[model samples]
Target: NLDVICIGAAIVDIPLQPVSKNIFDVDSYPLERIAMTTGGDAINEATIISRLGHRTALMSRIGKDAAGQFILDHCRKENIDIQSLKQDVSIDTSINVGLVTEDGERTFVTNRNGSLWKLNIDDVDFARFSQAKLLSLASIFNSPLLDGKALTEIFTQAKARQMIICADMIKPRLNETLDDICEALSYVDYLFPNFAEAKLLTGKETLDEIADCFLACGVKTVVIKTGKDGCFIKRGDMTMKVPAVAGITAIDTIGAGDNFASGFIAALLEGKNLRECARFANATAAISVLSVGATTGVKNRKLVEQLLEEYE
Candidate 1:
């Protein structure tokens, strides 16, 4: 059995150099540099987990095109099993244009028209998914096929197989609402969301209020990522804030949260406590920002261990 199975979008990202001007205002801009990398929540997190020495598999859909081939090759290089990835000739692989700012923040121009939203229940291999020790559903709000009922059923099935369920949501569009999210979170053992999403969902001002909202919605535990401020975690009576690692300035913040989830899940698989998991997660993410691309900064378990030792 694999340690973790991640189900979400498979995207190819073209990360551009730091922008000189707002992309929208410019009619044409010359990019000094760019790097093509396989991204998306599932692809990124699965790669991180595998690099951390876990057996991981990815389940997602991609186009039957060169982009799809790149993703398959990248997964093979990362040692992530991609046997469950579905390819459709009718659609094009999702492509994201990542534009970084001078301050290390990133903005994306994505074309997901024929991408993840098309994934249906039939696209999932439930039997294969059940074989994992943990099931991680990334980009929950971004995948329309895995809406509330679909996600609830998937979680119910995963629970029946005795697999832990971890979920994280992305930013929603203007139309998506909390009603589309809360019901599915009821099945998650770990509910991880960025600070903005937490505020958006709960409409609360304080972190505690946000965590309370998610906890009241039936989430067993809540981990709210506060970027730079570290992360806040709550499970039952246990609640604490883990500070971000100092002295490691970020070069690029892309995929930091996905990497954090990777480290957290990896530690949890080895029976680490919530607080320990949070610390490890912080270190993992901090390492990711030391370089340009998503997986590039994730060296290996040895470096992660070293960081943990030094940071602790």
Candidate 2:
């Protein structure tokens, strides 16, 4: 049986260094680095989870194209389970080009018509749920085909099997309300949303209120990832602020949150309490900013363990 199953889009990201001058000025623009990295919420988390020594599987659909194969190849290299991946010949896989500024801020040049938006409930074979102990939705509200209704469906079934559910999400691409997915939240064991995303989702100004909103919706625990300051965690009557690792320069913020979530889950799998989980998470995310690509900073469990030693 697998330790975890991460569900969401599997996208190929081409994150490169920004060029100095305008494209029209030169026939070929000079760039310091150009990398093709496995991206998207589920894939990123699965990479981290597998590297942290977990039996991880990806439950997502991809196109039967080169980009899709590229994602599969990376999964193979990382030793992630690929049996849950569904392949569709009709659609091209989603490819995002990250334009990273000198300060590490990025503007992704993205396209809509890709396999990223096409994954729905049908793409998942929940019959295999018995083989996994946890379910992580790389994000809710990412795929239009897998909207609130489908979210409830998936969460309900996953809950029925007694699987721990950890949900993370990008900010809504369209206008959405917490009411839209409240039912699904009722089944979530943990929610990992960035601080800004939590504010946007709950329409609350403060961290407590934002956490209160998700708790009211029945999520068992709410962890708001705040960059630099670390994460704010709340569950029932308990609340804590877990500080991030200071002193490390942030080279790229991309996928740091995913690594944080993976780290938190890693600790949780090891039976660590929430605070310890947050510490490990902070250490993992801190290392992620040392490089440009999402998965570049994290080499193995020892890297995080080494950092954890400094803080502890």
Candidate 3:
């Protein structure tokens, strides 16, 4: 039995630093640096959680390509269980080229042509999912094959097995609707969405209004992430704002949200309260942005714990 099971994409992230929208009229633009790293919500969060001293597993489909092998090798090196990783021979794995600007903002040019959007119910291992203490879905919007009904059923089944459901969402598709987003939230215990996603779903400008929308849809907790400004958390009738941790040279903001979720889930698993969990999450993300790749700054539990102590 693992401490957590992450279900999402396994992607190869190529980060290009110091690239800007202003660069034009050239076949190639010089960059500060470029690094290939294991990314995607499931792979990233699972890596962070495992490094933070948890037993974690990843369930995602990859292609029988070099990118897939890269993810497989990375999981093995990180000691994260990849027993459930599915390799489909017909397709190629996904890759994202993230262009990081001078101020640490990222613009991604993704090639998910043969990615987890193809994942279906049969690809999942329910028995494996049932054995875990928590199940986190990196993002629902990115998985077109895992529609709202399918997601609801998966969450219902996982909950029946006594697994806590924590989920995050990407930007909605042009064809998707607010109702579709809310339907999947019905079975989610904790809903983690960035500020833009929350505003998009709720069509409301205020944080409270956004939380109210998801809560009305039966979500238990709503955590809205605001880069640099911190995060807003809401549960039941209570709402609180946790400030972002400061004093870090943010090199890349690519995996900050995913790392934050990993940290928050880790704290929850350790029996920490909502506020405490958010604080740890902020600290976790702060450490993550100090380097290039998603997993660079999060070396071990000791590092995160030390950051938490400094905050305290």
Candidate 4:
């Protein structure tokens, strides 16, 4: 049995560092050198989970191509469980080119080429769900490949197995209906979404109200990351907000949220206190904002532990 099992799409991330864009003028910026790495919401989290010294498994589909081979090599090196990994020969692996400017914001150009979209109900393996202490999905691919029935089935099996289920609301633009979200949330124990997702889900502006709404739906914990404002965590009647750590210059903000999930989930799996975990997540995300790639600035367990001791 794995300590953590991540279920989501896997994509190759190529970071173009020191890229410049003239907001005042369109198409004025030029991209520079490229640094490719294995990245996806699930892949990055799995990387961190393995780094934290936990038994981790990844369930995802990628095309059988050089990019797919590249990430498979990285996963093998990271010692992540590849039991559920599938490589399809029909399409090429998806690629995301991230443009990180000097101001630290990111723009992504994605090419899926119908790879992960090929997944269907028949592809899901319940045996994998039965072996996980925790199950996570990025929830980004819920629209194209998976449907309402598939999601309900996934959650039902995971709940039947009594695994802790957590999900990240990846993009509001991808999925249209709130019903799809509500269906998945019923089986979710922990929900990691940014402030905007909370608003979109609950139609409430304040984080507290959004947190309360999700808790009312039986979610044990709701953590809303508020960028510079830090994170708001609500567990039952208790509500706490941890402010972002100071003394960091922002470089690029790409994948900071994914790393935030990595930090928070890592601490949670290790039984760290909520406040401490939130702070650690904040610090890790803040540090990630100081780099150029999605997973480039992402630190390992020792580095995070050192940061916890030295900073925060």
Q: Which candidate is the best by TM-score?
A: 2
Local distance difference test, each candidate:
0.85, 0.88, 0.85, 0.76
- RMSD of each candidate? 2.4, 1.6, 2.5, 3.3
Reference-based TM-score of each model:
0.92, 0.96, 0.91, 0.87
Q: After superposition, how far is residue 170 of candidate 1 from its true place, in Å?
A: 0.9
Q: Per-residue lDDT tens digits of candidate 4, residues 61-144? A: 888888889878888998988878888888777787776677766788877454556656565678778777888776544425
For model 2, which pairs clash? none
- By lDDT, who's the top model here? 2
- Per-residue alpha-carbon lDDT of candidate 3 for residues 1-312, written as tens digits (9 for 90 to 100): 489988888889887877666757467876656657898888889999888778899888999988899999999999889889889998778887777667766687876576766777666788886679999997887677777888988888898888999998888764687687677788889988889877976799999998999999999999999988779999889999998886666876878999999999999999999999999899999899988678888998888888877873
lDDT, candidate 1, at 264:
94
Q: What is the lDDT for 201 in model 1?
A: 70
Model 3, runs deviating above 4 Å: 16-35, 99-107
Q: What are the per-residue Cα lDDT tens digits for candidate 2 across 56-171?
A: 99988889988899999999999999998978898889998877555545567887888888889998888988888888889988877787889999988888889999999887
What's the number of clashes in each of the models? 0, 0, 0, 0
lDDT of 1 by residue, 1-312 (tens): 588989898889887766755658777667675657788888999999999989999888899998889999999888888889978999989888777766666678877585767776666788886678999997787778677888888888888989899988887754677777678778889988899877977789898888988888789999999989889998887889999887888976878999899999999999998889998999999899888677878878888788888884
